[PDB]
Homo-oligomer: A and B are copies of this chain.
């Protein structure tokens, strides 16, 4: 899997690598396409909203490695709103969203489930991060079914109910995304533990987004992204 979809830079002080560190490590590890997905601005220890707006200036391909502009947005409420403005959406390619205590504290199972499903149904998000987090109890099957319906991927997070999520996605028919949730570039692309979970449930390789740069880019285009010419050859 030459694609990693979830990692963080020094824009949060609880991460320690820069854009150039991720490019260099990708080069070393055979990763051909990666996304930087810094924490959304409503989070603690998070960057300013301009951090995301100004990603529009980034080079697309450096040293043969493609770079997606992303966000790990924060689910704000039971209506499925996230901390990403219209100007921010305009600059970004990949929208991940998830639960973080400073923004959305863990609540009753139904509150968590409704918020997650409303985020999925909003049409604004591509991947829900760490849905297996035991801190946020959810109706996994209902979430997987909604994710399949709205073509939203559920993440299996290497940084980490994950077998239950994987099996639920398998049966619901949706996509899985693998993400290292790296906070240094040293763990980019490392999915060993994710893969064991997927194997414990005989997850179909055909529904793993990270199989190839083209599979992932095709998914984003199906969700409405204008094609990125600079990524043709990936």
Chain A interfacial positions (CB closer than 8 Å to B): 9-21, 44-45, 47-48, 50-51, 53-54, 57-59, 62, 183-187
User: Do the beta carbons of A53 and B14 come within 8 Å of each other?
Assistant: yes
Complex alpha-carbon distance, A12 and B184, angstroms: 18
User: Do the beta carbons of A19 and B20 come within 8 Å of each other?
Assistant: no
Q: Which residue of B lies closest to A44 (CB)?
A: B48
A21-B18, A57-B183, A57-B184 given; A13·B48 CB < 8 A: yes
A183-B57, A184-B58 given; A51·B14 CB < 8 A: yes
29 CB-based A-B contacts, threshold 8 Å: A9-B16, A10-B10, A10-B11, A10-B18, A11-B13, A12-B50, A13-B47, A13-B50, A14-B48, A14-B50, A14-B51, A14-B54, A15-B54, A16-B19, A16-B58, A17-B18, A17-B19, A17-B20, A18-B18, A19-B184, A20-B21, A44-B48, A45-B47, A45-B48, A45-B50, A45-B51, A54-B183, A57-B187, A58-B186
Query: Which B residues are in CB contact (< 8 Å) with A184?
Result: 19, 57-59
Query: Which B residues are in CB contact (< 8 Å) with A44?
Result: 48, 50
A34 to chain B, nearest CB (A): 14
Complex alpha-carbon distance, A136 and B64, angstroms: 40
Query: Which B residues are in CB contact (< 8 Å) with A48?
Result: 13-14, 44-45
A48 to chain B, nearest CB (A): 4
A230 to chain B, nearest CB (A): 13
A119 to chain B, nearest CB (A): 24
Complex alpha-carbon distance, A15 and B11, angstroms: 9
Q: Which residue of B lies closest to A9 (CB)?
A: B16
Q: For the A-B complex with A19-B184, A44-B48 known, give 17 more contacts whose Cβ atoms are closer than 8 Å.
A: A10-B10, A11-B13, A13-B47, A13-B51, A14-B48, A14-B53, A16-B19, A16-B58, A17-B19, A18-B20, A18-B21, A20-B185, A45-B50, A58-B184, A58-B186, A59-B184, A62-B186
